[PDB]
Design a protein around this ligand. Structure first.
Ligand SMILES: [Zn+2]
Ligand SMILES: [Zn+2]
Lengths: 306, 306
């Protein structure tokens, strides 16, 4: 038993990371088949980032100005193209380590693993969520741009995020692997403020089921509620409204535990109105919202990847 | 910027995991060179675990009773030996993916990554610490035995933990790769209670430096203290005593921030006596003690692994 914030094993992604340099800018790229994907701001100077015209900047670059290195070994760039906010560098060699993969675009509330890298070299792996305001709260120092987020289903890597930006408040923004930003953010060094970072209610509920399965039970109470009554309290605490869809997704955890979803909602309502009174749940003094229902089921059941 | 609980990239370890079955018991083994290491309780039935005599049990096993599978492929066992609480199964093939490696024995307070596996297949990676009572707080379901903990220095994997036991309170016990348990625990299904799980003070202090570097600063105050005065409060709150050695280890973070170690100790003393008053530090409502000083330096500087 036990319950930890867990990332996917990162080896399949480690085998795809490369270094991309253009002029004086170095960042990371993702090498899949014969394409390397990277942020288009690789072509920018620090000065360019204040008001970049990327089509104009890109005209001054040739294939030979994109230096791509995979370990100690150089890759030959035979084409380049811009797709939204990513560049696709065609190389003359297919990555021999390319895993089965998909590109997907995730919704707020979904979780994914990030492989933080520098100079094409993996440093660490962690687990995070797309926030309701379309930011992520990561760990990204200068040079981490182009690091990716992903989920794994058995042997298939679903890439969902590429890192591009830190906002002036220290939260992070980036794109899917089609180069479309999550949320309203742009790849320019400008005033970009994030909206309310609400709490992902369905994920908190999943985690409270995890707690009960893993023997933390002190917060269970004698009450129930309704979606509409719960949602009046969610609104007042900057929680996402709970929908019947969310109730349906929590069905399997409800069936396992025998705790009706709306009963768990009443426990959550109490926790919001009363606080934890100096107690902890699964080692946290805050209600944790970076586990999805699927994450809880997976970790409580023992699912593996080949 | 940002600061996350981060595991090491797990690919080098993924390439070493295998499945080991003996009779009806399946668990994980670690394949390095031509040796597979696994918990010796692979030879036990659930019944045997109540009072096992492992030398006697092991006499009834031959090389051909240890089934070792690496992916879809069987390995041939050409010898076996018991070393403390691990078995070493000699195989006729060296693992072609063997990384540079060391076996080390860590001290309480040190952190490491765990690659949780089932049936020889990696499921997830997380980050944890050897507690002062020699337990770890992991996520281990039936079948996870033999999963390992490790640290990476560039390209060298230091293996420090192999999972063996869950205590009746749901915390975890295991061995180094020489098969010696951490702490007083044994591989028998018996009354084994853990001692006080104190807080790793030097690690909390490191994390408060991380907070200041990453712009969380509200807890900085006008006070200082002394080691002896601080330690009177540590004792009263079930914190580990702080030593001059610990002060020395925090020197680089003190130099970066310009906050003297004993000043940070006075901030920590306030936090202990006053609580957080509903505030957070780096996303936590608890003082986090699973980052070492070295972890903080690494993550705040951008260190990579090849
Ligand atoms: Zn960048
Ligand atoms: Zn076991």
């Amino acid at each position: 038993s036990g319950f930890r914030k867990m990332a996917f094993p990162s080896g399949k992604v480690e085998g795809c990371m490369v270094q991309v340099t253009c002029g004086t800018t170095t960042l990371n790229g993702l090498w899949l088949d014969d394409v390397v994907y990277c942020p288009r701001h690789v072509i920018c100077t620090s000065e360019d980032m204040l008001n970049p015209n990327y089509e104009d900047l890109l005209i001054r670059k040739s294939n030979h100005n994109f230096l791509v290195q995979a370990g100690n070994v150089q890759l030959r760039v035979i084409g380049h193209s811009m797709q939204n906010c990513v560049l696709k560098l065609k190389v003359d060699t297919a990555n021999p380590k390319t895993p089965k993969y998909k590109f997907v675009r995730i919704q707020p509330g979904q979780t994914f693993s990030v492989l933080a890298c520098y100079n094409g070299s993996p440093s660490g792996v962690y687990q995070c969520a797309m926030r309701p305001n379309f930011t992520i709260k990561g760990s990204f120092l200068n040079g981490s741009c182009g690091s990716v987020g992903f989920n794994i289903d058995y042997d298939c890597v679903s890439f969902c995020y590429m890192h591009h930006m830190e906002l002036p408040t220290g939260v992070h923004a980036g794109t899917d692997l089609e180069g479309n930003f999550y949320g309203p953010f742009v790849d320019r060094q400008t005033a970009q403020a994030a909206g309310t970072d609400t709490t992902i209610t369905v994920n908190v509920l999943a985690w409270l089921y995890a707690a009960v399965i893993n023997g933390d039970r002190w917060f269970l109470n004698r009450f129930t509620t309704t979606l509409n009554d719960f949602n009046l309290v969610a609104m007042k605490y900057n929680y996402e409204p709970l929908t019947q869809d969310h109730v349906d997704i929590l069905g399997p955890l409800s069936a396992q535990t025998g705790i009706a979803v709306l009963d768990m909602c009443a426990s959550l309502k109490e926790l919001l109105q009363n606080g934890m009174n100096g107690r902890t749940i699964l080692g946290s003094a805050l209600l944790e919202d970076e586990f999805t229902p699927f994450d809880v089921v997976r970790q409580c059941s023992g699912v593996t990847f080949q």
